[PDB]
């Protein structure tokens, strides 16, 4: 049975980047529904007893994939943030890979922002690493996650409107720009 | 040169089904941006001088299509509502076609609701008529519109979260159920 992941911060701790209200709905309602849906859809199927990751890696398009992908996406999303990150940029191997693959962190930010803002409709902008250690930015529609393509997901921006509408309404770009301030690079680095 | 369509009611007139705030953002920002984007993108292309409808019917996937589809979708959407419709259900030819194709109005509502609630991500539930006079319910992802497929669009529900999030947050089904009270069947009938 799939369980709600625990937030490593209080509901109001990401203010003013993300409001308490947004967390209450985004985590407390949307993620809860996705978890509930996955627990309802799986019993008696080949997916019963599989991890979220394994479902995302295996399932074809459909409700199971949609819900598993959203569980995985939101889990990594919420757990990649911290109220007051020590570092506002990655170091070590991740830092070097970003310099190698994007020229610099600042250029990476620019490309990540553009992917986030340019994704039409609902989805996720993802930074991932492939099996040869190369980084990629992808636009995952709807509930998709880079695990399906055999990539290892490192950092994401949720550009479903529910992620920002109560705080930014239509101003997605403004929301995206603020997210950099709450990324917990220690968490992200450990995903490499 | 693409113009904002005129709302046939005041911004606050659909309360409490849709709030003034929602109309101010949905019409006054989102639709405005789509129209602005058409005015930015179309002049100087093969689409210059064409109607929105013709662009939706002809353009491939991409930003022009996305914007045109959204302009058409929102135009029909906003103009299909009235604060106090004359009737709560369609009459005449449309009334009969609905009975023919869905068994009854009530069953049509049920199937329309299910398409609306079941569309994952951003999109539009559409009732349309084909060239032989037969009705169809489709789920159009993102900016898509039935005109692309050669159908004539009659009635839609916008299930992009921006359409309802300020008023219903995650409770899409509740929003969908309330819309029926403000459908201006006189407008919809004349689209047949
Ligand atoms: Fe989300
Ligand atoms: Fe909309």
Author numbering:
A (entry chain B), B (entry chain A): 1 to 192
Task: Tell me what the authors wrote about this structure, in their words.
Only a few metalloenzymes have been rigorously demonstrated to be cambialistic in vivo, including some iron (Fe)- or manganese (Mn)-dependent superoxide dismutases (SODs; SodFMs); metalloenzymes that play an important role in cellular reactive oxygen species defence. To study this process, we leveraged the existence of naturally Fe-specific, Mn-specific and flexible Fe/Mn-cambialistic SodFM homologues, which differentially utilize these metals to catalyse the detoxification of superoxide. By combining phylogenetics, biochemistry and structural biology, we demonstrate that SodFM metal utilization can be evolutionarily fine tuned by sliding along a scale between perfect manganese and iron specificities.
a,b, Residues at the XD-2 position in cambialistic S. aureus SodFM1 (LD-2, a) and B. fragilis SodFM2 (GD-2, b) were mutated to those found commonly at this position in natural SodFMs. In the cambialistic SodFM2 from B. fragilis (b), all mutants displayed lower activity with Mn and the majority had higher activity with Fe, representing change towards its most likely ancestral Fe-preferring phenotype. c, For Fe-preferring CPR Wolfebacteria SodFM1 (CPR-His), mutations in both the XD-2 and water-coordinating H/Q residues were necessary to shift towards the inferred ancestral higher Mn activity. The likely ancestral phenotype was proxied by the closely related SodFM1 from more basal Wolfebacteria. g,h, Single mutants, but not double mutants, shifted metal preference of N. alba SodFM3 (g, Q/H mutant) and Woesearchaeota SodFM4 (h, VD-2A). d–f, Crystal structures of S. aureus SodFM1 LD-2G (d), B. fragilis SodFM2 GD-2T (e) and CPR-His SodFM1 VD-2G H/Q double mutant (f) were analyzed to investigate structural effects of these mutations. The structures in e and f were solved in this study. This provides further support for ‘redox tuning’ via subtle structural changes.
